[PDB]
Amino acid sequence: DSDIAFLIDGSGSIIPHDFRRMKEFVSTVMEQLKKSKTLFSLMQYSEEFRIHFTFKEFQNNPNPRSLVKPITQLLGRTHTATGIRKVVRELFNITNGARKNAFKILVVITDGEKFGDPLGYEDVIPEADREGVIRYVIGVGDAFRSEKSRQELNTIASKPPRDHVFQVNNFEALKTIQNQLREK
Ligand SMILES: [Mg+2]
């Protein structure tokens, strides 16, 4: 009943240690929320976009660590807003394996520093809301240590943001999110 997409920040500001943390987080979530009728898809972004595995692909090889291990960091700039628009139109596309009727959940993993993107969040969130995409945000690095980045996470997250924003090293986030997914 659920199509859960990951939008992971692979921009150069993301330190290698943190990008690995992202991959570890993604893998654990997929292994945890592994519910028979739950598919996953992942797109990495910088100024470029890489769909690592579509829902159809996951459906063909539902092995998280197999799908995640090969992922290499793109580096470059941080076009988070464009990434969100592309996720909504591309990952949640039936030709990519996305299912009609299914709940749409997007997990954005970033340090909260959008940079270079011609789009602002104001240009993309209304569309995500209209297509029913529930948004969780996982902050890495110094995301929670600046006024700007904290608010960026809040802007991307569905409301109330406090219930949808988590720190990547809060290992208890996954079960909290899992608990919340029973209340979609
Ligand atoms: Mg960046």
UniProtKB/Swiss-Prot annotation:
Coiled coil region boundaries: none
Tissues where the protein occurs: Predominantly expressed in monocytes and granulocytes. Expressed in neutrophils (at protein level).
Every VWFA domain range: 3-181
Carbohydrate attachment residues: 93
Compartments it resides in: Cell membrane; Membrane raft
Role played: Integrin ITGAM/ITGB2 is implicated in various adhesive interactions of monocytes, macrophages and granulocytes as well as in mediating the uptake of complement-coated particles and pathogens. It is identical with CR-3, the receptor for the iC3b fragment of the third complement component. It probably recognizes the R-G-D peptide in C3b. Integrin ITGAM/ITGB2 is also a receptor for fibrinogen, factor X and ICAM1. It recognizes P1 and P2 peptides of fibrinogen gamma chain. Regulates neutrophil migration.
Subunit description: Heterodimer of an alpha and a beta subunit. ITGAM associates with ITGB2. Found in a complex with CD177 and ITGB2/CD18. Interacts with JAM3. Interacts with THBD. Interacts with complement factor H/CFH; this interaction mediates adhesion of neutrophils to pathogens leading to pathogen clearance. Interacts with TMEM268; this interaction inhibits ITGAM degradation via the endosome-lysosome pathway.
Family: Belongs to the integrin alpha chain family.
Disease: Systemic lupus erythematosus 6: A chronic, relapsing, inflammatory, and often febrile multisystemic disorder of connective tissue, characterized principally by involvement of the skin, joints, kidneys and serosal membranes. It is of unknown etiology, but is thought to represent a failure of the regulatory mechanisms of the autoimmune system. The disease is marked by a wide range of system dysfunctions, an elevated erythrocyte sedimentation rate, and the formation of LE cells in the blood or bone marrow.
Entry comment, domain topic: The integrin I-domain (insert) is a VWFA domain. Integrins with I-domains do not undergo protease cleavage.
Protein name: Integrin alpha-M
Annotated organism of origin: Homo sapiens
The gene coding this protein: ITGAM
